[PDB]
C-alpha cells in the first residue's frame, strides 16, 4: 500500500513524493528502492426548561439619587442571585409601535422579571458585578 504512486492521464505511473515519471509498471516497482526514494521517505436548555414560573407581583421602590432601585423579593433558598440586564423595546410579544426606548429588567428564578424603562441614553451602568448587590440575610437586592 504505497500512498505515493498515482496514475496519470496518459497511462503512466507518477511518484508524487519524488515527483518522477515511469512508463511501464516494472519501472514504478523498481523506483521505490533507490537513493532518491529513500531520501524522500526519510525527509518526509435543561436549566431553562426546569425553571418554575408562577409569576408573583414584585414590589420595587425607585428613588432619584445624586452623587437606585430597592426591590423586595421573597426567599428563593438558592445560591443563584437575581440578575439585571438592559434590553431594547424592539422585541416584544405584540411589537407595539413607537417603541424606541430601553428597559432594565431584573429577573430571578422563583419570581417574575420586573422592568423599568429608561428614556435617557446613559445615566448609570447596568453591569452586575460592578454596581449591584444582594443581601441574602434580608432578601433585598439593589442596583445603582
Amino acid at each position: 500500500k504505497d500512498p505515493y504512486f498515482m496514475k496519470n492521464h496518459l497511462g503512466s505511473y507518477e511518484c508524487k513524493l519524488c515527483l518522477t515519471l515511469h512508463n511501464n509498471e516494472g519501472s514504478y516497482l523498481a523506483h521505490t528502492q533507490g537513493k532518491k526514494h529513500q531520501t524522500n521517505l526519510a525527509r518526509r436548555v435543561e436549566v431553562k426548561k426546569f425553571v418554575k414560573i408562577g409569576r408573583p407581583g414584585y414590589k420595587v421602590t425607585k428613588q432619584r439619587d445624586s452623587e437606585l432601585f430597592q426591590i423586595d423579593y421573597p426567599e428563593i433558598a438558592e445560591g443563584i442571585m437575581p440578575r439585571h440586564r438592559f434590553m431594547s423595546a424592539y422585541e416584544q410579544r405584540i411589537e407595539p409601535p413607537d417603541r424606541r426606548w430601553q428597559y432594565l429588567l431584573m429577573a430571578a428564578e422563583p419570581y417574575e422579571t420586573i422592568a423599568f424603562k429608561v428614556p435617557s441614553r446613559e445615566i448609570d451602568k447596568a453591569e452586575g458585578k460592578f454596581w449591584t448587590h444582594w443581601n441574602r440575610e434580608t432578601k433585598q437586592f439593589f442596583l445603582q
Binding site: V45, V47, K48, V51, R55, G57, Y58, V60, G79, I80, M81, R83, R85, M87, E91, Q92, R93, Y103, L105, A107, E109, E112, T113, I114, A115, F116, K117, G128
Partner: peptide, 17 residues
C-alpha cells in the same frame, strides 16, 4: 452557575409596574 442561569432566563417577559 450564575452565568448559566443568566443565559437561560427568559428576557421577553417584560412587566412594567
Amino acid at each position: 452557575k450564575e452565568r448559566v442561569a443568566y443565559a437561560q432566563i427568559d428576557w421577553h417577559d417584560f412587566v412594567v409596574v
